[PDB]
């Protein structure tokens, strides 16, 4: 409560609203991967579902997570789209 | 002729290939832990 | 860390008679180290030399009194009287004498006054002694190129390219002509015949290699100056490897690759030379059949040799002169005409010997 | 140092310092001979003596040098299996060049490259000469080296955890699982990944991983 | 059997790396254990004189010594009949028609003006240096507007002595044009406006090729912010020779983003990967902007716990996003133990040693231990630094030091100030080079029976005490709760031997009550590097400190905090701390201790009539001057020519008393000692020392022109 010194959270693999619109339903795995760059978050053991994360806070003023995660069926086909902003 | 160095080998845990609830497997097999004389330590003598 | 192999000094000093120094007109340096032909020439008791920046003179061949001088250094532009680095020889042709800058800017010089007839850019610095071809001066630029200019204005008659080099073995091929057959040395041991009229390869030829991944003699300041006595030619190799060939052939008559030569002349039957060993070999016309060599000032850095009163002259880099009994075969006279020394052409026309020391402007001897 | 002498006596001195341990003078005379009679057959026997002492001398550069020289000299030789094990040994040695661990120190966290090299050598041994006179030694070096790399990566992840790059974290824990769910570092790390996800409301994976260490609560 | 090649003995090179010629020998199929080819005497002689021709000599023959030996072993000597290397005499720039040729050398790497008035390398030759000069000239026109410019050819001649190189240039001087406009083209991926602004040329201005390339690669970096590894972008000019202008095609094309997965480091065995991985402000698991990688690199550099920050990105094979970073780190290790000893008569030669491990185990923990000594005033020092106390980077440095001198010369009373103390430093990196700090400095001192000296006694009354004047009896113990601060902005290159950058060491020291000696003050250090040689081998070496004392409550600089200079780095050539106010004692007699008329510093044993004394004690204010030019020793090392100058003085030196005695309130008393910032390397470590010319010696200064260690 007496430290103005804080950093900004230099983490990404973020999203563009372009990236947002970039993908629609049932779009296939390789297709979406190229269309959005490979992901880095996806369950070790569960389904083919995928995550995609935005991450920041500029220090003392609000933390901005923004992840969309991405469900996937058996045959590498999208099944559902799942965004989430901060909190 | 004893192994100059540890035998912390002997304190390494027998690696439990882990054991998870169903449908939760992970492709370990990238590794190379084949399981087959020669001492361990004292008589582990490297005279050729 | 400079253990260069110095040579024997002046041995067995001898002067059968009096090397009378006719005079020593030292008009003013000059060259410096700066190896370059720039050799001074004469015409009718009137002789001609030049500085290394644009100054040119015309003198008396009795005392070296100046008949007149001129400067040439460009009086404006990138330098007020820009050092123009005259490096062509001294080519005399009637009212017009010629000079070669190291800026590809020839200067035809109106002899009568020193009027700059015309300065013409060419394919590079004019290292070789420009040669007259009866309306055509023979400029052999640095970069293997070769161009003739109209004596009257410098019309570029043509632009024969030639024997393009890789590492510049000194490309002062002094071109020569035979009945209207333009000949010239080259930069890659390859003499080439040329149509005197408009520069067409009458034939080419290969004699020697040339320094750079195939290295040849680079202490033989080669007379890149094909002499042509009657149509059997005699060309010095770019490392003095002897040769003789039919004028309009290039087909070898014979060749003494033994030779690796600085400069040369020939008389009647005896050829002469300055091998890199810095020793002539009295050599008969037929083959490199030898009469004698003389390794006395072996490996001393020398000038061209020349004849005088039926005696052979030769200049050293240290103002010593080494008249040689032409048939046997060693010195006959000697004098330290300078400390400055020299390398360029000792000129002996009309029985008057001429030198420009590498800085010590013209000296002139007799006996 | 090298006094030239009868070669049989050269190898004699070599064996003298061998049974003793004066690796310096031994190696001197061995290299002397392979400057004197180098391409001879027992001169690669000399070379084996050389690699031997070079390790016994704890002189690892020339160890690698002569070992690889022996490999390029012979694809399979009488002592080449001992050579392979010695190569693995000198690599793992480089990984333990320092031995501060008994000054209350850890090495589970320094350069994990020679450990990869040794792990590879012992892999190539356990499936390339897997009947040698050096089976279980290499085997336990294998298992330990592996949990060692494990704890290394786990510490790295802990670092980032203290930093915040929870994604980097998750990926580390993952890549560890897919290199091992066995090595203690595994169970160690797991909560790392879990709190990480929690820093990301991906709580689904969090409680999944919870059940994971639950069935593996040991 | 002709074999075997067994002997290789390079002799007469005297100028090169013999093993380079050895790799050539192998490149000629020649080395120990090879097929002994008696024939190859002349062959390899040719090859290696050709090597000389390569290195720019062509003037060093060689003689090989075949030595028939028994069946296997052979001998061979290689007599390098060396001479004088090739030498450059002059350049020509043909076709030059817009600028002075010699000016168009005035940027050339290679040269011919190295005479005894101008120094530029030497007139040897290597075609590579040539090509550099070529492109230099090429730029030299392309910046100007000379589009069509080129280099028609070049060549280099040999004076027919193998001595003289000639230099020739064949140009076509471009015929300047006024570049018209630029056209972005291709993948900008929603980053247009910015890029367009990265190229806001002046309308139709002159052509300037390097300015273009700047626009180009700055657009590159610009994108790198948005994470594109190799934003393959091309700049193309389209010539309008008709109007004499040219238009510009900016072929833009980016890459992809979320790149960095697993950042290897290397060779850090001595050093905890944790700290290294902290010295990279690019948090992993994210995209890449190579400038982040660099700023990292520089951080690692400033740490100094390294030797080479070599980076290498790596597109991991398998998907364009798989991109990961190695760090080939070849950091050196130093056990920093150096004992510099000062010699210079009998009552003042000791000096001090550093016994410091320099981050034990590379844990990220430098920890200090230092000791010093003087006739009586003997001080030690000890420390422990936590560069990374918190995740952010907070540096925490413990400090400890001991004066343990009760003045045991006779028994005591000979300036007894056994005086220890300790403190910590809660150092912040306030900004990415800005750093104020903080700490709670504390120190015990005990004075007793000191030989009386005007300074000390003015102090005691500044203390507000009434010590019996001409008496070796009075005692004073003291401690202090001191509040600390201080500032430092380092953007230097390499923390051990630098090349360039800002070094400042503001150390704000004050005190607070509850303590004994109430006073305030502040110091600050000034020092920096910056190169003169732009090969980053000659460098200007700034250095200067500014001494200042003071005291709250009208009190005075508690004189255990008296600054000093003289001896080592502070000054050169002088003896230790022998610069500034040399104290003076009252015409004192009553010492309570009369030796056999020993201890002649104003005691009863004679010693009346105030002894204007030559005992350097220094005072509340100081500055020493030090500006230096590295010569990367052309004979870890750097060599300049020290000439430095310093001065010390007391403010409160009220000349009223000192009237007839050399004033010590006059700061303008600057000494000077000249020499050369020497440093060597022998097979033992980072060897370095100094030796100065103490000319501008003031009244009674005391010099030992030598110095040892660093």
Curated annotation (Swiss-Prot), chain A:
Keyword Signal: yes
Phenotype seen when the gene is deleted: Mutants show minor defects in the assembly of outer membrane proteins.
Gene Ontology MF term list: identical protein binding; protein-macromolecule adaptor activity
Membrane topology, from the record: Lipid-anchor
GO CC terms of this entry: Bam protein complex; membrane
Annotated GO biological process: Gram-negative-bacterium-type cell outer membrane assembly; protein insertion into membrane; response to antibiotic
Locations listed in the record: Cell outer membrane
Main function: Part of the outer membrane protein assembly complex (Bam), which is involved in assembly and insertion of beta-barrel proteins into the outer membrane. Nonessential member of the complex that stabilizes the interaction between the essential proteins BamA and BamD. May modulate the conformation of BamA, likely through interactions with BamD. Efficient substrate folding and insertion into the outer membrane requires all 5 subunits.
Name this polypeptide is given: Outer membrane protein assembly factor BamE
Organism expressing this protein natively: Escherichia coli (strain K12)
Gene that encodes it: bamE
Residue numbers of the full-length protein present here: 24 to 110 of 113
From Swiss-Prot, chain B:
Localization in the cell: Cell outer membrane
Task of the protein: Part of the outer membrane protein assembly complex (Bam), which is involved in assembly and insertion of beta-barrel proteins into the outer membrane. Nonessential member of the complex that stabilizes the interaction between the essential proteins BamA and BamD. Efficient substrate folding and insertion into the outer membrane requires all 5 subunits.
UniProt subunit comment: Part of the Bam complex, which is composed of the outer membrane protein BamA, and four lipoproteins BamB, BamC, BamD and BamE. Forms a subcomplex with BamD and BamE. The Bam complex has the shape of a hat, with the BamA beta-barrel crown in the outer membrane and the periplasmic brim formed by the BamA POTRA domains and the 4 lipoproteins.
Family: Belongs to the BamC family.
Domain notes: Contains two well-defined domains connected by a flexible linker. The C-terminal domain may serve as an important protein-binding surface for interaction with other Bam components or substrates. In addition, contains a long unstructured N-terminal region, which is required to stabilize the BamCD complex. Only the N-terminus of this protein is observed in the Bam complex in X-ray or EM structures, most of the protein must be highly mobile.
Protein name: Outer membrane protein assembly factor BamC
The gene coding this protein: bamC
Entire-sequence positions represented here: 33 to 84 of 344
Swiss-Prot record, chain D:
CC terms in the record's Gene Ontology section: Bam protein complex; cell outer membrane; membrane
NCBIfam families per UniProt: OM_YfiO, PRK10866.1
Quaternary structure and interacting proteins, as annotated: Part of the Bam complex, which is composed of the outer membrane protein BamA, and four lipoproteins BamB, BamC, BamD and BamE. Forms a subcomplex with BamC and BamE. Interacts directly with BamA. The Bam complex has the shape of a hat, with the BamA beta-barrel crown in the outer membrane and the periplasmic brim formed by the BamA POTRA domains and the 4 lipoproteins.
Location within or outside the cell: Cell outer membrane
Protein name: Outer membrane protein assembly factor BamD
Gene Ontology biological process: Gram-negative-bacterium-type cell outer membrane assembly; protein insertion into membrane
Function comment: Part of the outer membrane protein assembly complex (Bam), which is involved in assembly and insertion of beta-barrel proteins into the outer membrane. Constitutes, with BamA, the core component of the assembly machinery. Probably involved in transient protein interactions. Efficient substrate folding and insertion into the outer membrane requires all 5 subunits.
InterPro entries with a match to the protein in the record: BamD, BamD-like, TPR-like_helical_dom_sf
Pfam families attached to this UniProt entry: YfiO (PF13525)
Organism domain of life: Bacteria
Source species: Escherichia coli (strain K12)
Membrane topology note: Lipid-anchor
Family: Belongs to the BamD family.
Gene name per UniProt: bamD
Disruption outcome: Depletion decreases the density of outer membrane proteins, but does not significantly affect transport of lipopolysaccharides to the outer membrane.
Broad class of the protein's primary localization: membrane
Swiss-Prot record, chain E:
Localization per Swiss-Prot or TrEMBL: Cell outer membrane
Record has Signal as a keyword: yes
Cellular component, GO annotation: Bam protein complex; cell outer membrane; membrane
Gene ablation phenotype (knockout): Deletion is lethal. Depletion results in the accumulation of incorrectly assembled outer membrane proteins, including TolC, OmpF, OmpC and OmpA. Decreased expression leads to decreased susceptibility to contact-dependent growth inhibition (CDI), and decreased expression of outer membrane proteins (including in this study LamB) as well as up-regulation of periplasmic protease DegP.
InterPro entries (alphabetical): Bac_surfAg_D15, BamA/TamA_POTRA, D15-like, OM_assembly_BamA, POTRA
Mutagenesis / variant outcome for changing residue 277 to E: Severely impairs cell growth, wild-type protein levels
Disulphide bond pairs: none
Principal localisation: membrane
GO biological process entries: cell adhesion; Gram-negative-bacterium-type cell outer membrane assembly; protein insertion into membrane
Domain comment in the entry: Contains 5 N-terminal periplasmic polypeptide transport-associated (POTRA) domains which interact with other subunits of the complex, may recruit substrates from the periplasm into the outer membrane and also act as a chaperone. The C-terminal region forms a discontinuous 16-stranded beta-barrel transmembrane region. The central pore is ellipsoid, and probably closed by extracellular loop 6, perhaps with the aid of other loops.
Similarity-based family: Belongs to the BamA family.
Name assigned to this protein: Outer membrane protein assembly factor BamA
Organism whose genome encodes this protein: Escherichia coli (strain K12)
Gene assigned in the entry: bamA
